[PDB]
């Protein structure tokens, strides 16, 4: 019984947080990452939008 179809692929992903690091490399090495206390993000004031 040959029928025609186009599939729908989707991911499931629960019970973990969407974690992204804070460096120019973007890889968490230690606790304080490169951009965490760098030249640009150290003592100056900045305001995160989204």
């Amino acid at each position: 019984t040959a029928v025609d179809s186009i599939t729908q692929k989707k991911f499931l992903c629960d019970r973990t947080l969407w974690r992204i690091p804070f460096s120019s490399n973007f890889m968490s090495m230690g606790a304080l990452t490169d951009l965490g206390q760098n030249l640009l993000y150290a003592n100056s004031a900045h305001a995160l939008d989204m």
Partner: protein, 303 residues
């Protein structure tokens, strides 16, 4: 080479103040390290991470007042533990009882004294530690009480005792450590070892006051000198490694037996060097050689 008692003002500093880098106290040591001036590796400050790099600059260029009281008050209380002014389990109370005392009086002239007393109390540990090695202090004062109470220079029989006066004084000066002239009971007595396996009375010595000068028979234990108590006999063998020449070796046993007490020591140190060899050669004998002690018995009996 060895140390004095681990410095009491420093032991308490060891447990309180920073170890590696005290940026205010070791200011020109951190300043030498940050200026790339250190001879180990100059750029040890350059290759370090940037954040702790800044922590060294902020702390050294502007010196921050670190807390000094708890390494000064503890310096007294740990010296109180080494001088034994307090017990080791008392370190919880006296540390804070005086901190609560300076909580009430933080700010009088008393704490200006306290740090001068710190240098005094730490020196008192060093003074007493050198003084307990010479236990003469709790010995000469005790001998002063012995010399005053006991009638001195009264041998109206025959006099050889003038030499013996210095003989007891030589025991205080030569060996001082465990040599304490304890006055527990009214009879004076001297201990020689740390555990006191020959502590006889110096008032058992009062048996010798009538025997300061009597007639000598011949060379075998005398017909009269059997009266000398093993108590007083223990003293006269103990003064024997101190004084030899002076007391007449031909007039009474004060000298003849004192020369014979050297015969007991003279055999002992020879047999000591004899025993240290036969026991050492146990690979070639392969037996419990009590003949090392049996020959020692034979070298004392068959003479």
């Amino acid at each position: 080479m060895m140390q004095d008692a681990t410095d009491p003002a420093v032991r308490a500093a060891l447990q309180s103040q920073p170890s590696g880098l005290n940026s205010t106290d070791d200011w020109r040591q951190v300043m030498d390290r940050i200026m790339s001036l250190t001879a180990r590796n100059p750029d040890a400050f350059r290759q370090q991470p940037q954040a702790n790099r800044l922590s060294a600059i902020l702390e050294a260029v502007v010196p921050a007042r670190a807390n000094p009281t708890h390494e000064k008050v503890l310096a007294i209380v740990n010296a109180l533990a080494e001088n034994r002014a307090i017990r080791p389990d008392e370190a919880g109370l006296v540390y804070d009882a005086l901190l609560q005392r300076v909580a009430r009086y933080n700010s009088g002239n008393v704490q200006t004294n306290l740090d001068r007393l710190v240098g005094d109390v730490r020196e008192a540990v060093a003074q007493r530690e050198r003084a307990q090695q010479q236990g003469n202090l709790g010995s000469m004062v005790a001998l002063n009480a012995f010399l005053s109470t006991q009638p001195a220079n009264v041998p109206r029989g025959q006099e050889d005792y003038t030499n013996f006066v210095s003989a007891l004084r030589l025991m205080v000066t030569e060996t001082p450590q465990s040599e304490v002239y304890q006055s527990g009971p009214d009879y004076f007595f001297q201990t020689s070892r740390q555990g006191l396996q020959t502590v006889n009375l110096s008032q058992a010595f009062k048996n010798l006051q009538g025997l300061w000068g009597v007639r000598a028979p011949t060379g075998d234990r005398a017909t009269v000198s059997s009266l000398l108590t093993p108590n007083s006999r223990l003293l006269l063998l103990l003064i024997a490694p101190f004084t030899d020449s002076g007391s007449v070796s031909r007039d009474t046993y004060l000298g003849h037996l004192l020369t014979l007490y050297r015969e007991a020591i003279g055999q002992a140190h020879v047999d000591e060097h004899t025993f240290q060899e036969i026991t050492s050669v146990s690979r070639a004998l392969g037996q419990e050689d009590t003949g090392s002690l049996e020959a020692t018995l034979n070298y004392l009996l068959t003479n």
